[model samples]
Target: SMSYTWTGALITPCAAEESKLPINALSNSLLRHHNMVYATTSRSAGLRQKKVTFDRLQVLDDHYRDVLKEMKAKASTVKAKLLSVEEACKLTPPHSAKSKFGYGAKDVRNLSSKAVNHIHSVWKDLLEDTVTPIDTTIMAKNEVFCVQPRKPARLIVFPDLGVRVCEKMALYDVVSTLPQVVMGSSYGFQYSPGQRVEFLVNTWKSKKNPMGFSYDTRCFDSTVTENDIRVEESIYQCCDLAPEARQAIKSLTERLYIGGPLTNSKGQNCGYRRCRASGVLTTSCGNTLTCYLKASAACRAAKLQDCTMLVNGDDLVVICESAGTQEDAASLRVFTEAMTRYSAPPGDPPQPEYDLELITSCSSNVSVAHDASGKRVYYLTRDPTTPLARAAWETARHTPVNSWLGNIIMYAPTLWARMILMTHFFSILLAQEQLEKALDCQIYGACYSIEPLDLPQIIERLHGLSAFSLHSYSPGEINRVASCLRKLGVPPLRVWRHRARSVRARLLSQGGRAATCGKYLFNWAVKTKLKLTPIPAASQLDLSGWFVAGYSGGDIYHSLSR
Candidate 1:
């Protein structure tokens, strides 16, 4: 079936979309090659449409059915509940898009009677009407990137706020519970970055001759078939649900989930979508299920031995026993062919990787660096080009989301994030006394209200205290960082070291939380480092449900939902 059908209506932008990174006073401090940094806007969305719109062919055999049956068996054991209107409303993010109706996200969160009444009507309507296709709004997402071959803006298609709330009522608990139950250890959202690194290491070590490769799907959501969506709906039905929940779920599947009418932000008819919508509540879990099923079936088709998969949405990493280099190479091609037949073709063809470090999945790679104890530590790292580009943008413009803090937290062990991100951002924050502000940054698609000064303890709890004094990085990692720094026209390590020393000294003078930030985050910058110790606050933190699930575009407010 066609993934999309256009009505010749253009994708229009509602406001001024910034495509180029506007250079300012602080631009040169971060990247000298300012022109290399760019942001994708609605203008480039046509390119994305060209890439994503395609016909799909799916052939499900015994292997796919076998995995599906096993998954359904597990899914049947658990019962999911329908969230009340108030419960679903509370989950809406404060900054979520305003409804086509009179109210908005803030009104919903506060449980305004008008919002509650409308949401109830939406849910009730869902249970009553099961045949009509729902209407959805399509918009291009603005994101940062380094310009090599210019990538286009990602399209997000979502239904109205009321329908989204009803979706939460019917499927929130299912998405949060079902994937982990069915996939078990293979569910990638269940692990923290540290735990993820640990799992990959243990999985590799468990095999005598480990061979792994990452599968990159070409526009995974677009490749998803209507049959695939229905298959997942049947899987959702396996759960013991309330009569209203079941009815609403079935209605949503038929109306919204399977296919929908697409409307632009300007209220013009954009087209129609038969593929997976990025902004739906079930997107993460659905993609995870479909990806795991396809990859697992493909593994069987290739006759690979003891394949252990880590499925995070469309990102798949499979580690298995080697069948010799030549045989493994040929086996991967067979796997690719099987996946292609299943409508989940690869963007870059898979190749068997003998080394764990060579295999990248979920935009991160397993990297080696030494801790303060001189013990070898395994951590996750990625190419710093995008992070640096985004940081420079955020630096020049004071946007609400300061992802540099998230980068520094998640990639604290990396030389680029630690040296470049911390030194650069901390200096900027210090110039204006906003370190005390609790800004939002996301980890695993879940938004966290993180304070900049509390980073030491957060790092300790999430990545361990080793993040503070990690040094002696692997050569491959070192080379990647150096090459990235040179390419981005970023200053060399020595300059950052000098700048961090000054930043550290100023922070130390302030004492209290500022002192902790200086003592912990910038320990490596100084010749005589402060003795790192375990943070007492780390153990006291209520970090439950931190890495439990991903709520990418489900209008989620992390703690507010809980």
Candidate 2:
């Protein structure tokens, strides 16, 4: 068989047809690196699929299969590790679930010299053996992780939290194009060279804890940055990234995959925020097979996501190549607009507390559907650190003329005006209204740590479980927040984001008119109207099983309450 390669674009002479041109090719300007490579195996007329019985010189054929085998093996190992990491991440703690005040037992457990060594060593080995090593000298200059000396054991400990992404799905598929290492079965059959090593080391050293597999490690480990990259893959390919930059992709992707994709899985790709092709470059696959191979090598090297294009900002971000059929850019534009419209205004008092509000996404349609129910949102009070009992200080003194509306107004002063301003821009963002807007969760923003509660104690006493008590409202009346008083005293995880992490607590009344999300928001509003006091089990059933499930089977109980 014969083969050829060209850079600008290829016009190949098909055996049965006339000359054909390449559908698309990377250009020099668009090339990510100064030099890159691409390889193509020419198909032969023979029927057997195993080997390409090219009617070429014998020596060239032998070398051809070897190269093909190595590349395939590399990709295969990377894929398998990607899969394993994905599985392990499902068991990991969420970035948002850890400490805001300080470190939890788990966080402290993880910060041990053993844990840090495991994580760092895994990353270092993976890079050295499989892909390229990060410039350690440069990393040292950045003070990425704080190093401290611990006595008795007489060991030095370093911070090891924020560098990697929490394992997430959308992230993994994108990073799989790179290389990996086969660490031997002892280290798990394979690893993404970077994160796999870190994960294994932690597991091995973590097992040494006398308490047990989870509690010992959990009690000692410190938390990492919770604002893990949303779309880490896009950020990985920057020509500007340090060599260490690519090393963290594997772990980050796996965590994100387990957490969930940032965008709805089925959403259309607008192509608004995806990689932009630089231009066109031509490659000359000369008549010789060797020349073609050389050309392919160049193509592969030049193709990477890092140098493509970037949306510069403080937000830990991600980029995606949209499906050719969808208009992702347009959707992104809408999202950005909505994000800006609803995003907290600068200088807004660091949210008095994680407050709950009823928000609607609709303009016309109003219905109390799941998508349109009233949501029981919670707001971090002005003094989230204030004892729960002290909340009474912030509570309303006299009954309001219209309790529900007044309560909503009290929590969010501009709730009504903001709704009016957001009306026309709904569709542009491809989002429905915040039907039932309540501060259900905090994705980012301040940190706090509560002494984790023992499972047996909680299961032993169920009916007495109250939100006020769990949150420690009594300052003097109630006991201190259990999760807050732990040995670690809730160390900060360093998420450093302003966005309030939220969860869908309850649906509210119909928000507006144009769309359908309003109705759900309305119903959720109804629930909020009823929740005058903090109720722990407002929507969920309080049971041992339910409690255990949310608490990771009693592992991270301090982060949860009945």
Off by over 4 Å in 2: 1-110, 125-232, 250-411, 414-562
What tens digits encode model 2's per-residue C-alpha lDDT throughout 1-562? 1111112221111223211112222111111121111111112111211121111111223333443344335434443223233232332344422322233334433454443444445555544443332110000000001012100111111112212211221123322222212112211112221122233333323432211000000100011111112222322332123344354443332332112211111222211101101100000000011111211222123221211111101111112223222233343333333222222112111111110111110000011111112332122112112221111111212211112221222222112211211111121122333322222111011111211112112212321212111221223211222232221122221110111011112111222221222221122222332222322323342332221111111111112333
Predicted candidate 1 versus true structure: per-residue lDDT over 367-434, tens digit per residue: 99898889999999998889998998898766656678878888888899888999988888799888
Q: Tell me the deviation in Å of residue 269 in model 2.
A: 31
Model 2 global lDDT (CA atoms, 0 to 1): 0.21
Please state the error at residue 17 of candidate 1 in Å. Answer: 0.6
Error of 1 at 480 (Å): 0.9
TM-score of each: 0.98, 0.19
